[PDB]
RNA sequence: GCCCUUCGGGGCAUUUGGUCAAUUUGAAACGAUACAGAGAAGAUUAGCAUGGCCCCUGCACUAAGGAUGACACGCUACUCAAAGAGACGCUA
């Protein structure tokens, strides 16, 4: 349960959690630090970029600990996905052909753009200009096409 | 990056965003202060309307209030002459 239980109604995590617990608290403390990052010098939409970046990083850590290295059990993986330690839909896109490096879900929400497009960061870099350092207004992505 | 392959080649994925963060120079509103002081032909006053490039409060743009909310109190030649005498004089 994502809802907090006091101490005596908490159930223990599945086995193998204590091996990755330090990195999980590293990601949690990184996100808590991302909460307190000055917005005085950057545009408003740039204030929310590190949260999407850290969510991507933590989901990628869980995803490649289970699918590439296979160093965690399936029960532990489903418990991590169910208790908010990884974004299950972003992982689900990562297992698809062409979305393996997708930055975030909001960058493929085609129903919510002006002309029903994806984000410009979904575009392969070869079809973009040189000296064009694009930086996604949704998350700060600099290009998340699979060929990149 | 991955997948398919008759290793010739092919496939999956496809253009975000009305926002400079940056307050003197792209537009807030008063109050205090000074000043003036609430309509109906003596004095004192309850009101209800009327007209709209005057509004305020209100959910009320089918209430009720805001001094009867305020405002009105001004300014004023022009559809415009005819007579029958007399007369400085005109004139037949
Ligand atoms: Zn994104
Ligand atoms: Zn994007
Ligand atoms: Zn992206």
Q: What are A130's two structure tokens?
A: 């040189």
Residue A130: phi, psi to the nearest 5? -80, 155
* A119 strand B contact, CB < 7 Å: yes
Taking CB atoms within 8 Å and a gap of at least 24, the contacts of A111-114 are none
* A35 strand B contact, CB < 7 Å: no
Residue-wise DSSP of A25-59: HHHHHHHHHHHT---SSS-SGGGSHHHHHHHHHHH
Experimental resolution (Å): 2.9
The answer to whether A132 and A41 have CB atoms below 8 angstroms apart is no
- The total number of residues shown for chain A amounts to 148
Q: Is A127 annotated as a binding residue?
A: no
The answer to whether A93 and A56 have CB atoms below 8 angstroms apart is no
* A100 strand B contact, CB < 7 Å: yes
The answer to whether A94 and A63 have CB atoms below 8 angstroms apart is yes
* Rounded distance from Cα A4 to ligand 3 centre (Å): 33
């Amino acid at each position: 349960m994502p809802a907090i239980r006091p101490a005596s109604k908490r159930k223990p995590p599945p086995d193998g959690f204590s091996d990755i617990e330090e990195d999980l608290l590293i990601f949690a403390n990184k996100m808590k630090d991302a909460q307190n990052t000055p917005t005085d010098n950057i545009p408003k939409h740039q204030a929310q970029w590190p949260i999407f970046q850290i969510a991507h990083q933590r989901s990628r850590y869980v995803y490649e600990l289970y699918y590439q290295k296979q160093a965690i059990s399936k029960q532990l993986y489903d418990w991590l996905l169910k208790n908010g330690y990884a974004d299950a839909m972003l992982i689900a896109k990562w297992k698809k052909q062409g979305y393996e490096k997708l930055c975030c879900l909001r960058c493929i929400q085609t129903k919510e753009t002006n002309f029903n497009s994806t984000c410009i960061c979904r575009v392969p870099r070869a079809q973009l200009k040189e000296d064009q350092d694009i930086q996604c207004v949704n998350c700060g992505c600099r290009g998340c096409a699979s060929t990149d």
